[PDB]
Structure formats: C-alpha cells, structure tokens
C-alpha cells in the first residue's frame, strides 16, 4: 500500500512476469528493465536529480542521485542502474547522505553568487536541492571561474557563468528539437556550452530548452526580470494558436499575463510547447480594442453605447437583406459562439455561415473523415508515414515532434508529398503532384510497395487541402490507397487528417460549411468573427460589415461596425483538437475595457433584432450543443468515429493536375493574436 509519486501508471508490457525489489525495506513490483530511479519512484521516494529528465536519454552526469544498493560496493548512481531482482536499495543511509552533501558542496563551490538577480531564484532546482539535502556552511575563499555570457536570438538569453555542465540542453537539442547547434566544448573547469560560430537557434521548442535547463542560465528574454514565481498565480488552460490544443498554464499577476508554461499531459503534448505559443501573450496585452465603435460617414470611428450599436446593426439586418446574409466563424472561437451564431442566422432566416478555413466546396461530414483518427499517443506505434500536402513542422508542431519521436525510437520510413521544405528527420520526398498521389493509389511509385510491406501505416492529409477545389478526388485516392494497402483494419485505423486551426474541428462538427461559393461576392450583410476573407477583399462596395472580434488588426479597416470581445485567456469556451478531443479553457485575467463574450453578444443581438434565442445561460447553450453534437458536452474525452469513409465523389475525372500550394507561411505572423503581437514579429524578422 504505497502509491507512486504523482501517480504513475506503470506499463507491465508482459504482465505475467515482473521483478520485485526492496526499496528502503518494504518491497515493490517493477517491469523487466526499469531503472533504479524509477523503482524508487514507484516505491514512493523522490531522489535528487539534475541531469535526468523523463523524456531525454539518461546520462550519469550530475552525480547527485546517489543511493546505496546493498549487495554492491559503496556508491551507486540511481539512474542508469538497471534494477535487479532482490537488490537491497537504500536511500537514507549515512553513505547516501554524505554523498549528496559532498556533491552539493562542489556545485555550490564553483557556482556564481548572484541569486538575488538571477531569476529562477525561487524556482531553482539547485537551490531547493541544496536547501533540502545539502549542508549549511561553505568552506571556500579562493577565486571562482567566470565565463562570458552568450546570445541565442531574442528568445533564450544566457548568463553562462552558471552552466553547471549537465548537458540537458545538449541532449534535448540533439534528440527532440532536431537541429544540432548547441554543444559542450572545452575541458576541465573551463568547459562552456555554446555554438562555436556565434550563430542563433532557428528552431522551435527553444522555450522548451529554457524550461529544461534547471539552473537559471538559459532564460526567456521577453520575461527578463518582470517577476519571481512566488508572486503570480497560474490557471490551467489549453491553447488556441496551434491546432493540437496544447495543455498549458498561464502565469498571471493582477490583470496582466506574465508568461505561459507547459503542463504535463501524456496524450497531446508530452511536456513541451511549440515556440509560437510560449511567446504569444505580449501582444494580447499590447494591441487591443475595448469599445463598441461605429463608422462615422467621414470614414472615421466613434465610440458608442451597446444599446445604440446593437440597435443599428439589428435595424439594418432586418432592413435590407432578404437572402444574402453570411457569417464567417472566427479562427479562434468556441463551439458556444459558433452554435449561437448559426442559430441567430437561421432564425434570421437567411443562412450562409461557414467556418474560418473550411473549403467552399462540398466538404462532406464524416467524423472519421475530418478528424485525426489515431490518437497522437498511438502515433508512436506507426512504421510507415505518408504525409501528403503537409509540413507538420510549421503547423501542429507538437504532432511534428511526435513524428520525430517515433522516427528516433524506431526508424520509420516517411514519405512526404508537396512543396520543398526542410524536414528534420531523414524524410523521403516523393513529388509535388496529386498525379503522383494517383500513381501511388495505383501501382507506380514503388513506395506503395513499402505500404503493403508495412505494419501499422499512417496516411496524414493536411487540412490545407480543404480549401483546394478538387478535394473529393484527393480523399478518394486516399480511400483507394487504404482499401488496397489494408490500413483501415478494425485493430488499427491509421488514416489521419491534420488541422491548422483551433476552431476548425468544432466548426466542421457543428456543420459550418458554405451552402454556396460566391457568398461573399453576392452578400450585403457580412458578420465576421475572424479576419482574412480572401485578402478581406471579395466583399463588395456596399455591404454592411460587422466585426464582432478582439485584438483588431486586420479587416477592421474594412469593417463598418466594431464589437469588442473577450480573448482566449479571459473566457470559458470549448475547443476541439484534431484527434477529436474536446477541452475547455478557463479565465485567467479580467476582460479589457467593456468587451463581452461571444455567445452573450450574439444572444443580445438576437433579442434586440426580434427573433430571440430560447437559451440564455451557458448550461442551456451546452444543452443545445448536446442536441446538435454531443461530445462537445462530453468534454475531456475523445470519442472515436466508428464509421468508414463511404463518401460519394463528384469530380470523377482527375485531380486537376495543379501542385500543392503552401498552407501556412512565416509561422509567426499567422494567428492574429501573435500577428498584432510582437515578439513573434521580431522572431519573424530574425529567426528565419
């Protein structure tokens, strides 16, 4: 009766047999080749560590996790020590205590002495480990060693005076990141970590580097000295910039968000964060609109009251448009707002509502057709990848890191179709043509053979193809590949479709697909929640444009009425991510100015416009949600789609023989939040 640390679901790959070891007395059961450190963990005792991370390789480098294993000589490094059946582990014996005391003595001997300026002071492992396990007095007077600090782009500044030679950053940058730039060079006490040609680090996950590095040397530049940790509160939310819906924790003080950091979730993003998201808050603070505005006929903007704004918009809506009413659902919006907007429009009678990046074409709706079937976790079990029209390094960076994790674990041949790009794992480039996709759905391109000679293949279609005119042909060619290669078996459904927004899944789920094509052209009253509608341009000269949005930067100069809303860190909505898993964010900081939530503003607009919505509380909104699509109220559990892709094609001729266009560019100026934000702007200016 002893629960593991934090709770830790052991695997038991072969549950018929498993060794047992004595940890500090009482026994514990352990799988075949588990390390002494994880055995002690299962037994429920934490061992001090510096150079061991559960996601990177092992290296007996810090020499602090020492324990004594009776039936052995004096010292033993806990990590990298494979457990043996019956070894007599011991952690709190004078031998181990003195070992830890001495090692901490050496570290703090040749450490710098600048805690009260070195942030991570209050979070530092080395600090807490010394205070809890090390001695209380130092005996040292002579001069220490100091090195010069280093620059690694405007994300990770380093005062290398305190690089205690752990090689955590090196092992991360060479295993998970993919780009080999950081490296440990020198000798003896004179040993630094730094790129030898003063280059920068043009990769994501560098924020993950600053989280990995325990002692406060590699630290985020835009969070230079703004706060210690004990000062600010953390709210556990999800992400909306990427499409994976990463699980993060917003650390905020007062009405200001200071930083965001990953939080463990062993199903979506292990413990990492893509570089885009960690620095996406500064502009969320920086640029903002916080008053309902009306365009005065001199082309200017005046701040009006909610009564007047809603009255004028409802009046003109009822006034003119008989059948030409269209509504664009935002790129970063929640199912609540989407269902409220669709209900308001359908009660208005005229319905052309559609999501952000969902194609104007047919875009049939089968959950197995438009969600990533194999969960990201299961993605670690593939053998042959078939990325088509996708650069997952730039979109869904966490899925890219997962694919890299698979290729690192066991070499898995990966074939990629589309434009030239710089993959970081030994990729095969198969061409740029859906014509090649046809040939491989047929017999040429011997890579198809690999599929047939494959166990657990994976075929990943990027959501950028939804906007292409001929999508049913692509999906039908993929269907034929699947049928002929046996990749849809009931044991394993490896036919995945990525996404490149946070609202795309819930939009396609509720059914926001445009009933026609020239909707924006023929319209006269457009209701926007998100920008870009093609170069914000297809809207005609005379058209009532109402931008019910937040953080206005683009298309606002086209808007006719402006309604401020609450960002993704100030409200409670439901976002669905590509594997079909529906999470919910939580409020962290007060709304800015006098903006209101999206479903609230929609319901108020409906009432003042006459036809009202039968619901006026989040509970009834989610009840309507249960009526239209249930998992969205079955939040926080992925509900698979146990129906095949038996769609009906409508092109039946060819795949239009046009190359695959690039779906997302610059990786930072997308996502209006970051775009009107800033650190992403200078990262775009430099780290490219």
């Amino acid at each position: 009766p002893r629960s593991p640390l934090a709770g830790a679901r052991v695997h038991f790959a072969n549950p018929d047999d498993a060794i047992e070891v004595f940890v500090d007395g009482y026994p514990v059961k352990i799988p075949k080749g588990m390390t002494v450190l994880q055995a002690c963990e299962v037994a429920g005792v934490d061992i001090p560590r510096f150079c061991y991370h559960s996601r990177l390789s092992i290296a007996g480098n810090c020499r602090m996790c020492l324990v004594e294993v009776e039936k052995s000589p004096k010292p033993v490094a806990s990590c990298a020590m494979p457990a043996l059946p019956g070894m007599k582990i011991k952690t709190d014996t004078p031998v181990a205590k003195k070992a830890r005391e001495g090692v901490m003595e050496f570290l703090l001997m040749n450490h710098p002495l600048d805690c009260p300026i070195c942030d991570q002071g209050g979070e530092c492992d080395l600090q807490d480990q010394s205070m809890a396990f090390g001695s209380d007095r130092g005996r040292f007077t002579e001069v220490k060693r100091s090195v010069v600090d280093k620059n690694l782009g405007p994300l990770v500044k380093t005062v290398m005076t305190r690089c205690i030679q752990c090689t955590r950053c090196v092992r991360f940058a060479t295993e998970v990141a993919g780009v080999q730039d950081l490296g440990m060079l020198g000798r003896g006490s004179g040993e630094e970590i730094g790129t030898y040609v003063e280059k920068l680090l043009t990769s994501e996950l560098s924020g993950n580097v600053i989280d990995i590095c325990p002692v406060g040397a590699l630290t985020s530049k835009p969070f230079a000295f703004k706060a210690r940790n004990w000062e600010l509160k953390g709210t556990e939310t999800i992400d909306v910039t990427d499409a994976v819906g990463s699980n993060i924790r917003i650390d905020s003080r007062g009405p200001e968000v200071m930083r965001i950091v990953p939080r463990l979730n062993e199903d979506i993003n292990e413990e990492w964060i893509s570089d885009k998201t960690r620095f996406c808050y500064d502009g969320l603070k920086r640029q903002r609109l916080n008053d309902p505005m009306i365009r005065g006929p001199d082309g200017r903007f005046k701040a009006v009251n909610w009564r007047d704004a809603l009255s004028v918009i409802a009046d003109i809506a009822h006034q003119v448009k008989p059948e030409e009413i269209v509504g664009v659902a935002g790129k970063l919006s929640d199912a609540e707002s989407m269902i409220a907007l669709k209900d308001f429009l359908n009660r208005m009678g005229s319905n052309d509502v559609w999501g952000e990046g969902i194609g104007v074409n047919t875009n049939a709706d089968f959950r197995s057709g438009y969600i990533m079937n194999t969960s990201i976790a299961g993605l670690e079990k593939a053998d042959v990848f078939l990325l088509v029209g996708t650069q997952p390094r730039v979109e869904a960076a966490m899925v890219n890191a997962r694919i890299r994790k698979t290729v690192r674990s066991n070499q898995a041949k990966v074939g990629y179709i589309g434009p030239a790009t710089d993959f970081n794992y030994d990729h095969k480039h198969l061409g740029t043509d859906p014509q090649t996709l046809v040939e491989i759905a047929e017999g040429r391109h011997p890579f198809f053979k690999t599929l047939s000679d494959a166990k657990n293949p994976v075929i990943i279609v990027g959501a950028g193809v939804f906007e292409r005119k001929d999508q049913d042909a692509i999906f039908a060619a993929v269907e034929t590949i699947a049928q002929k290669a046996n990749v849809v078996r009931p044991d394993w459904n490896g036919l995945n479709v990525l996404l490149l927004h946070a609202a795309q899944a819930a939009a396609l789920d509720l059914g926001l697909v445009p009933q026609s094509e020239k909707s924006l052209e023929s319209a006269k009253f457009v209701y926007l929640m998100g920008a870009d509608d093609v170069n914000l341009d297809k809207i005609p000269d005379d058209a009532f444009v109402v931008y019910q949005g937040h953080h206005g930067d683009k298309s606002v100069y086209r808007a006719n009425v402006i309604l401020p809303t609450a960002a993704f860190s100030e409200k409670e909505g439901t976002y669905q991510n590509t594997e079909g898993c529906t999470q919910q964010t939580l409020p962290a900081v007060p709304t800015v100015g006098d903006s209101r939530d999206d479903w609230k503003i929609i319901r108020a607009l409906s009432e003042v416009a006459g036809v009202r919505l039968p619901y006026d509380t989040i509970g009834a909104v989610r009840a309507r949600i249960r009526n239209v699509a249930p998992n969205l109220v079955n939040v926080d559990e992925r509900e698979p789609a146990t129906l095949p892709s038996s769609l009906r094609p409508s092109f039946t001729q060819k795949v239009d023989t046009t190359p695959f266009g690039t779906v997302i560019e610059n990786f930072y100026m997308t996502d209006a939040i970051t775009r009107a934000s800033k650190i992403m702007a200078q990262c775009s200016a430099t780290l490219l």
Binding site: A566, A604, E607, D616
Partner: peptide, 15 residues
Amino acid sequence: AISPFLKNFYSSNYF
C-alpha cells in the same frame, strides 16, 4: 421589458 439577461448585459460582463 427587455428579458433581464439583456438588462445585465448592458451593465458589466460579470453576472
């Protein structure tokens, strides 16, 4: 009569 939801909505957004 303005369906008191709206009456609150015109005031602050914390109800």
